[PDB]
Amino acid sequence: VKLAVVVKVMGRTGSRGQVTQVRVKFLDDQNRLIMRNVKGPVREGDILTLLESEREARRLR
Amino acid sequence: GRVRTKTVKKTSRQVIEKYYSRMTLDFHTNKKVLEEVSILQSKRLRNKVAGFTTHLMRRIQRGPVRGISLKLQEEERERRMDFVPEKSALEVDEIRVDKETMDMLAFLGMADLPGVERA
Amino acid sequence: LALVGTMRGHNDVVTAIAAPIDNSPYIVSGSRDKSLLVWRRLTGHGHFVQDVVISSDGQFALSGSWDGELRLWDLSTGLTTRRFVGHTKDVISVAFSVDNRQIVSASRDNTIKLWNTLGECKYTIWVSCVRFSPPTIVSGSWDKTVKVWNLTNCKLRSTLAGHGGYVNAVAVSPDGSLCASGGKDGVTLLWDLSEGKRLYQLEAGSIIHALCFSPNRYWLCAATEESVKIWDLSKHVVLKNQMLYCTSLSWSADGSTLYTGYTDGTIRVFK
Amino acid sequence: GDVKLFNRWTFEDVQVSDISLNDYLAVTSMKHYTFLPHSAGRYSAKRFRKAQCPIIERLTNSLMMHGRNNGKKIMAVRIIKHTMEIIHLLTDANPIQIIVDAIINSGPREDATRRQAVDISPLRRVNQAIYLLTTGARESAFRNVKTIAECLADELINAANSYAIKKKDEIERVAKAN
RNA sequence: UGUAUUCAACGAGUAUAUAGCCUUGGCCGACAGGCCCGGGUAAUCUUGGAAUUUCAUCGUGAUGGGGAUAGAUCAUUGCAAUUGGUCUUCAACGAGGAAUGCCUAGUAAGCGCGAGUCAUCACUCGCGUUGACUACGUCCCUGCCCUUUGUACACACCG
RNA sequence: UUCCGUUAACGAACGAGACCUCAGCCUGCUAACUAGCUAUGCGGAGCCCUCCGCAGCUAGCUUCUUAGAGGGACUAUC
Numbered sequence: 068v069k070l071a072v073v074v075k076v077m078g079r080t081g082s083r084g085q086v087t088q089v090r091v092k093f094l095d096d097q098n099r100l101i102m103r104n105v106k107g108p109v110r111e112g113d114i115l116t117l118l119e120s121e122r123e124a125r126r127l128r
Numbered sequence: 129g130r131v132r133t134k135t136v137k138k139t140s141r142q143v144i145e146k147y148y149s150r151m152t153l154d155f156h157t158n159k160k161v162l163e164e165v166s167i168l169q170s171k172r173l174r175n176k177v178a179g180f181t182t183h184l185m186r187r188i189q190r191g192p193v194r195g196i197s198l199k200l201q202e203e204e205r206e207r208r209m210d211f212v213p214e215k216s217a218l219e220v221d222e223i224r225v226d227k228e229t230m231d232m233l234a235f236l237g238m239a240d241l242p243g244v245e246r247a
Numbered sequence: 248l249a250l251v252g253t254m255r256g257h258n259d260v261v262t263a264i265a266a267p268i269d270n271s272p273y274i275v276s277g278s279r280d281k282s283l284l285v286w287r288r289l290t291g292h293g294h295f296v297q298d299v300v301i302s303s304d305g306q307f308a309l310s311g312s313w314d315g316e317l318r319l320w321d322l323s324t325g326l327t328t329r330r331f332v333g334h335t336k337d338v339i340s341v342a343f344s345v346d347n348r349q350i351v352s353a354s355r356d357n358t359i360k361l362w363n364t365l366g367e368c369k370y371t372i373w374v375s376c377v378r379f380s381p382p383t384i385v386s387g388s389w390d391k392t393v394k395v396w397n398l399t400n401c402k403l404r405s406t407l408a409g410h411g412g413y414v415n416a417v418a419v420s421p422d423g424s425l426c427a428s429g430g431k432d433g434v435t436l437l438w439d440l441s442e443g444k445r446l447y448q449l450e451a452g453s454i455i456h457a458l459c460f461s462p463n464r465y466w467l468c469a470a471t472e473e474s475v476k477i478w479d480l481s482k483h484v485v486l487k488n489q490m491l492y493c494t495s496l497s498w499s500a501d502g503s504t505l506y507t508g509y510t511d512g513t514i515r516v517f518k
Numbered sequence: 519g520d521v522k523l524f525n526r527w528t529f530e531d532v533q534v535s536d537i538s539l540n541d542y543l544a545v546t547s548m549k550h551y552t553f554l555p556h557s558a559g560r561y562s563a564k565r566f567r568k569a570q571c572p573i574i575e576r577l578t579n580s581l582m583m584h585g586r587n588n589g590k591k592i593m594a595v596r597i598i599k600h601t602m603e604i605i606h607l608l609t610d611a612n613p614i615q616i617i618v619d620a621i622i623n624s625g626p627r628e629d630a631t632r633r634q635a636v637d638i639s640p641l642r643r644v645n646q647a648i649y650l651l652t653t654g655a656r657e658s659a660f661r662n663v664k665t666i667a668e669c670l671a672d673e674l675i676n677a678a679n680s681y682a683i684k685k686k687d688e689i690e691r692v693a694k695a696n
Numbered sequence: 697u698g699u700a701u702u703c704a705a706c707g708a709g710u711a712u713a714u715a716g717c718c719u720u721g722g723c724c725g726a727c728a729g730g731c732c733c734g735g736g737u738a739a740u741c742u743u744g745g746a747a748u749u750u751c752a753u754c755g756u757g758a759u760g761g762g763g764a765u766a767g768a769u770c771a772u773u774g775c776a777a778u779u780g781g782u783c784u785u786c787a788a789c790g791a792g793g794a795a796u797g798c799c800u801a802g803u804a805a806g807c808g809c810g811a812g813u814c815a816u817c818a819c820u821c822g823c824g825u826u827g828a829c830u831a832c833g834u835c836c837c838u839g840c841c842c843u844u845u846g847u848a849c850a851c852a853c854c855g
Numbered sequence: 856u857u858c859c860g861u862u863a864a865c866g867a868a869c870g871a872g873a874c875c876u877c878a879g880c881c882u883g884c885u886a887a888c889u890a891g892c893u894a895u896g897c898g899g900a901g902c903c904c905u906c907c908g909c910a911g912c913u914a915g916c917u918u919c920u921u922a923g924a925g926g927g928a929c930u931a932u933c
């Protein structure tokens with residue numbers, strides 16, 4: 068339950084291109100920058116919730 | 129898409145090449161001049177040509193382009209002949225001679241040239 | 248010269264600002280917004296109106312649209328008092344007569360037309376903006392020349408060919424004794440109507456939309472693209488989207504104010 | 519204010535208890551709140567355009583199923599009015615609040631695709647919640663004494679123990695195992 | 697299912713023989729159908745042009761969903777029986793396995809109308825009505841195109 | 856294979872684009888008794904006002920329908 072704001076979008080990835088990989092920062096701690104993936108439609112400036120804040124990602128997944 | 133057919137590109141280039149004197153920046157003035165300075169059948173082709181000409185006037189008002197000619201700076205000649213200083217850029221004294229060139233001037237050349245230097 | 252205020256009630260270019268001779272606060276702005284305004288709105292045309300004027304009595308408004316026609320309007324009711332149709336090419340400018348009974352119009356058809364306000368007799372003789380002499384008529388041409396006509400028989404009086412660029416409009420003295428031009432050359436030519444010879448020049452720099460003569464100060468205000476320039480008749484300028492150009496200048500009857508027609512509707516008053 | 523839902527519901531009482539699903543729901547009482555969820559506006563033109571659409575419009579448009587029900591938005595908004603009256607009269611609160619609570623408690627957070635688990639878009643979250651609620655109401659309404667409004671009302675209050683919450687539970691269970 | 701509001705476009709329509717087409721209106725007939733007054737060789741006349749929407753009986757039951765199938769019966773079309781009216785009969789059918797097709801906006805989906813077919817009998821071509829979910833990405837599959845590369849293929853990998 | 860450019864290529868033919876039909880906007884124009892809008896007059900009901908129908912060989916108009924010439928958009932401005 069660590070709400071994160073989408074900071075940049077790294078293009079659609081995946082087999083069908085359904086998942087979209089983005090970089091986010093926490094609203095509780097702005098200075099921490101993580102990479103995650105999101106289904107559905109995502110634009111910059113949005114706020115996204117999660118459950119586990121420790122999972123990492125890769126560039127151009 | 130919005131890219132321009134070679135016909136409209138060409139005709140815009142020609143109308144600017146031969147009619148840069150009066151044609152202005154507004155699109156509607158460009159089209160009302162095009163309709164009588166040239167015969168274009170399709171009205172929307174004429175609109176495309178007028179808009180393209182306006183875009184190239186925006187391009188050219190900052191500097192010259194690679195497309196048009198005549199009055200070959202943009203509108204007036206005599207750009208570089210005026211770059212003639214009252215004294216030549218080439219000096220004649222203490223003119224850039226080194227050890228091996230000194231040995232050369234000891235060879236067939238004259239070692240007492242006016243521009244000889246000990247550098 | 249200082250700022251009075253700003254206007255933002257227009258969505259396109261206002262091309263002509265006309266004020267009644269009687270100095271009454273019923274000025275008419277004719278715009279290429281397909282709409283007019285009264286400081287009442289007019290929309291009877293279907294194209295972009297260019298030139299507007301106000302009758303001598305000050306209770307009517309004459310405006311011509313780029314569709315190629317002209318209309319004289321009942322200002323109070325906002326309805327056309329009369330139409331004027333027969334300019335196949337788009338009209339460019341309008342003006343009244345010395346008695347404000349005949350209407351002179353210049354269009355894109357390389358010709359000028361005189362119309363009766365009520366009569367059915369019409370006569371004809373790219374002609375730019377025209378302004379009748381308060382009785383010859385001056386006009387701009389398509390070859391950097393300014394023509395002066397004769398009202399006695401609709402004949403050409405003389406031609407003035409000293410302009411390096413095209414002539415976008417003409418200026419006449421309030422007493423009908425001067426002529427002035429301007430254009431892309433940036434040098435405004437001033438001549439005398441009587442002899443029709445070149446008097447002198449003033450330096451501005453670029454296109455001047457409207458050249459307005461001061462009725463009282465005997466001055467000349469020009470809407471140069473670089474900076475609006477005002478001369479006194481010492482020939483010396485004794486006025487300031489990435490593109491910024493005016494469209495018209497209008498001298499007030501009082502003489503202490505002036506009104507500008509701009510591009511994005513920012514009508515500005517100076518005093 | 520001067521704008522109320524069916525001249526009956528006041529929008530200036532409903533908030534969202536989250537800072538991640540605010541802009542996607544048109545519940546703010548400054549704009550985007552309408553008289554009824556029926557409007558002939560275009561929302562599929564550009565991306566993220568349906569976020570500006572009112573939430574009630576989304577709820578009433580997601581009920582025109584199955585193929586024997588589409589093109590009948592009139593029944594949809596009538597049924598939403600009936601279920602709205604049921605909810606307000608029972609719970610003694612603003613039915614907009616119950617709708618928002620049900621939507622905000624019926625959105626799944628994570629899925630698993632490609633099999634790796636990863637999060638869900640908030641617009642997809644609200645869309646999935648609305649689709650789940652409508653399908654659950656349809657399931658509870660088929661071959662039963664209940665009418666549409668009654669099952670819709672029950673699923674709306676139960677989601678503020680319910681079909682939609684159990685569907686989200688199993689989806690999240692499948693997600694969290696990978 | 698039964699009452700009661702009611703909003704479209706496209707097109708088509710005569711040989712006048714009493715009258716072959718569109719049919720208005722009046723009368724008769726439960727309905728199907730018949731007689732009379734007639735109009736339109738056409739923006740004139742047909743042309744005055746449904747789902748949906750208040751109200752109620754159902755009440756979760758293979759039930760008033762469904763009407764397959766049958767019998768009795770009347771009349772129209774046709775030279776000669778096709779269809780349409782009335783009642784009775786009331787089958788499978790309670791969202792459909794592997795597979796599988798169409799579609800991104802007034803679109804899909806739902807509901808009718810006209811024309812072609814025609815002595816009589818509606819699938820195809822258009823017309824309009826109600827009207828959304830998601831996506832706005834990709835080459836994962838199915839293909840298409842280009843560049844490099846390999847080839848013992850050239851009927852060209854079904855080689 | 857649309858263009859800009861690069862260029863042992865230069866200059867050209869098709870295809871694409873261009874073209875044509877229809878729809879989308881016009882209180883601008885053209886003009887409508889085989890199409891309409893409004894007022895009035897008459898008759899219908901509860902002077903006026905709500906109101907339905909009928910004329911006025913021009914009451915006026917084409918905003919509403921028809922069909923024509925035209926315009927509008929060209930990516931121009933940010």
Ligand SMILES: [K+]
Nearest residue numbers: 763764785786
């Ligand atoms: K049956």
Ligand SMILES: [K+]
Nearest residue numbers: 896897898906
């Ligand atoms: K009356």
Ligand SMILES: [Mg+2]
Nearest residue numbers: 697698699749
């Ligand atoms: Mg019914």
Ligand SMILES: [Mg+2]
Nearest residue numbers: 702703704745
């Ligand atoms: Mg209708």
Ligand SMILES: [Mg+2]
Nearest residue numbers: 759760761762
């Ligand atoms: Mg049944």
Ligand SMILES: [Mg+2]
Nearest residue numbers: 761762763786
């Ligand atoms: Mg049955």
Ligand SMILES: [Mg+2]
Nearest residue numbers: 813818819820
């Ligand atoms: Mg067939």
Ligand SMILES: [Mg+2]
Nearest residue numbers: 917918919920
């Ligand atoms: Mg009209």
Ligand SMILES: [Mg+2]
Nearest residue numbers: 171172927928
């Ligand atoms: Mg156009």
